[PDB]
């Protein structure tokens, strides 16, 4: 459940299939955005996990797994930024800003896309009967 | 102050519940008691071997004596002011290393002084056995101290050995042609069928422990049990969060178990060193000064004064010896408590700073008044407790109890400590 290996797959396909050179930058920006979202999520989720561990309802090894993930995410972000610097000269000062924006922006876009499906779970749950034009036919 | 790379047991990441704590304490106790019985392969002191939880001819011949002696060494060092988590860690690792080197020294001392004698492979085997047998006890105490066990194992093991010896003196099933007071009395009441003759014979019983000693030890036990209940209570109130009114009690025995055990350890070391010095060299002025040995007991020397009294006869024989002995045994605990309270971390200054952190203040006393009263109460309480413990020990010795004089006292203090800890934790 990650957007990491997809960029590497695109790279191995680029090595042979002659894909356009901007698609690399596209996949790179996407991987960066996912890393930024994950970093924010973990920075915000540290305290509640720590409290649950201190109260003693989560176990022992999960906290160590968490602490390992916290730094693995950072190393992944650093590797991605290094690859970005490799891809274009003098292109790191702009990259972090572009990434911090696309993260939030595509999160909003997905949340807004979700209502086209969320509209029917309510119908199935409350057994409504809605005809055309969205009105109520009781 | 140097690098430390030694084996240790890992602490629990979360606080262990009560039931696992109890099970660990029980299993550690069973392991120690089993280790106590099994005798060595390469196959005297009465009160001290009982007060230091060691019996001769078994893997546990060394006992907790090296650890308690290292504790005495660091207490003496802190007394002369020769001395942050790093400082505590350095102090603890120093305690451990002096303990292990003292074990290494004590094993060789015992094997040189032992009746086994010099005539080598079996000798090295014996040294290795005693080394491992004491190292396991040190590790077990550290385990119970890390948090798995209720309290430090050093006190519990000695209390258990003393309680088992007390039970064995009364309920012994071995027959002599019975070793236990109650079983011998119950048998002789039936077979002899001469109650007036039977009682007058069983009551004194110069040969073996009698029922009289049992009644005396029960009496002194019940008496010393009530003394511990005494305490000094001072009311406190909170200032940061209002509505929190509490009570801070101060016990008459601020450090109950510590002083008598330290005194017993010091007596054991001095007696053993005097014995080996008197044995190694036949005649010397200083050797004869530190003590002379004859029929075995020490007499006419430095050890002659410090060794305990047997009964009221030795007391009424020479009064000067009794005077110097009582004064020494009282002053020793009196100075030992005031010195141990500092390094233990429970100084009036430390508890005053803890009050500052908590914010608890006296209802009617001002800011500095609390600290000035702590300095007025805590040291005097520690001194009086140290003196009272020695007084009760010498009194029980005069009473002629069946066990060691201070043994019953140690049992009471340890049992009450563990009971109060379990009550405070709950469950």
């Amino acid at each position: 459940n990650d957007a990491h290996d997809l960029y590497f797959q695109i790279k191995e396909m680029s090595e042979n299939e002659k894909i356009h050179e901007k698609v690399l930058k596209a996949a790179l920006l996407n991987r960066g955005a996912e890393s930024v979202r994950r970093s924010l999520k973990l920075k915000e989720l540290a305290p509640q996990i720590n409290l649950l561990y201190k109260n003693g309802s989560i176990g022992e090894d999960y906290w160590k797994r968490f602490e390992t993930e916290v730094k693995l995410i950072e190393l992944e972000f650093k590797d991605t930024l290094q690859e970005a610097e490799r891809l274009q000269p003098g292109w790191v000062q702009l990259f972090v800003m572009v990434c911090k924006e696309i993260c939030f922006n595509q999160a909003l876009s997905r949340r807004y896309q979700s209502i086209l499906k969320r509209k029917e779970v309510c119908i199935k749950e409350w057994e409504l009967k809605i005809n055309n034009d969205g009105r109520l036919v009781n | 102050p140097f690098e430390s790379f030694l084996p240790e047991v890992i602490a629990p990441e979360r606080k262990v519940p009560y039931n696992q704590k109890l099970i660990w304490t029980g299993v550690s106790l069973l392991i120690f008691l089993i280790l106590g019985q099994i005798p060595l392969y390469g196959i005297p002191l009465y009160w001290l071997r009982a007060m230091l939880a060691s019996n001769r001819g078994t893997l546990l011949e060394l006992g907790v004596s090296p650890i308690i002696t290292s504790s005495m060494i660091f207490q003496f060092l802190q007394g002369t002011q020769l001395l942050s988590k790093q400082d505590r860690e350095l102090f603890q690792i120093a305690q451990k290393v002096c303990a292990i080197i003292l074990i290494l020294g004590q094993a060789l001392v015992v094997v040189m002084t032992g009746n086994y004698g010099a005539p080598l492979p079996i000798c090295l085997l014996l040294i290795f056995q005693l080394m491992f047998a004491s190292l396991i006890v040190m590790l077990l105490d550290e385990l119970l101290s890390k948090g798995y066990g209720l309290g430090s194992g050093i006190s519990l093991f000695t209390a258990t050995n003393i309680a088992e010896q007390i039970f064995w003196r009364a309920f012994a099933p071995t027959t002599v042609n019975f070793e236990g007071a109650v079983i011998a009395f119950f048998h002789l009441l039936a077979v002899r069928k001469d109650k007036k003759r039977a009682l007058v014979e069983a009551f004194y019983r110069t040969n073996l422990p009698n029922m009289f000693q049992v009644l005396m030890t029960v009496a002194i036990f019940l008496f010393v049990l009530y003394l511990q209940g005494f305490r000094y209570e001072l009311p406190i109130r909170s200032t940061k969060v209002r509505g929190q009114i509490g009570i801070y009690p101060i016990k008459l025995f601020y450090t109950s178990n510590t002083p008598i055990m330290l005194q017993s350890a010091l007596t054991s070391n001095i007696f053993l060193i005097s014995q080996i010095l008197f044995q190694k060299y036949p005649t010397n002025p200083l050797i004869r000064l530190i003590g002379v040995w004859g029929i075995q007991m020490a007499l006419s020397g430095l050890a002659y004064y410090i060794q305990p009294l047997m009964s009221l006869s030795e007391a009424l024989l020479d009064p000067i010896k009794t005077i110097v002995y009582i004064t020494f045994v009282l002053g020793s605990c009196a100075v030992f408590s005031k010195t141990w309270i500092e390094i233990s971390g429970t100084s009036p200054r430390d508890i005053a700073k803890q009050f500052k952190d908590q914010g608890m203040v006296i209802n009617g006393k001002r800011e500095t008044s609390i600290y000035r009263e702590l300095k007025k109460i805590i040291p005097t309480a520690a001194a009086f407790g140290g003196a009272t413990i020695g007084a009760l020990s010498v009194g029980s010795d005069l009473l002629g109890t069946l066990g060691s004089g201070a043994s019953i006292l140690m049992a009471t203090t340890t049992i009450y400590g563990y009971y109060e800890a379990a009550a405070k934790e709950g469950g």
Partner: protein, 190 residues
């Protein structure tokens, strides 16, 4: 697996059954690629675009002008088209604090129009998104309570009215809505 189209420059998954996360990611990468193809500057700036904003405002004004003409059916379609354009043709690397308030200011007008027209479920869902993205005001809770009452959900109507009155207690319409909800629910039970 995944096959790369040649002329369209879109990455397409060629497997028969792909999980959901991979589909969302491939859609995002398609959008980013098609946008980078249109954006010709090598070093792009988070500075927003102007022609897109002008055309969005033009469509929105052409849709809002139907209020003067009393045309309440095609204005909804026009506002929906404008929101769809501002959702699709706005490259994802454009600023957040300028893409959020435009969406909100158009979506609120769409909600008012749809709630006047008669459709209720769509209005309630739009209100739920608008209130979940971080906008809590008495200008949203009253309409959400109106929708939950009109499409026959009473317990959540009471819960929402109470949450609303616990943020603007001096309001004058939330109390009317609360009284109506209490009466209708006391009928729903007894």
């Amino acid at each position: 697996t995944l096959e790369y189209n040649a002329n369209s420059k879109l990455i397409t998954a060629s497997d028969a059954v792909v999980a959901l996360s991979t589909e969302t990611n491939i859609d995002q990468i398609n959008v980013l690629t098609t946008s980078l193809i249109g954006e010709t500057n090598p070093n792009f700036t988070p500075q927003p675009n102007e022609a897109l904003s002008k055309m969005i405002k033009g469509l929105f004004e052409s849709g809002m002008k139907n209020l003067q003409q009393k045309k309440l059916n095609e204005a909804l379609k026009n506002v929906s088209l404008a929101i769809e354009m501002a959702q699709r043709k706005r490259a994802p690397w454009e600023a957040f604090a300028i893409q959020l308030p435009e969406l909100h200011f158009m979506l609120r007008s769409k909600i008012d129009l749809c709630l006047i027209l008669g459709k209720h479920l769509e209005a309630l869902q739009d209100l739920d998104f608008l209130l979940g993205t971080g906008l809590i005001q008495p200008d949203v809770f009253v309409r959400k309570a109106d929708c939950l009452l009109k499409l026959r959900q009473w317990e959540e109507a009471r819960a929402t009215c109470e949450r609303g009155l616990a943020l603007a207690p001096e309001d004058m319409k939330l109390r009317a809505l609360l009284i109506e909800t209490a009466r209708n629910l006391a009928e729903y039970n007894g």
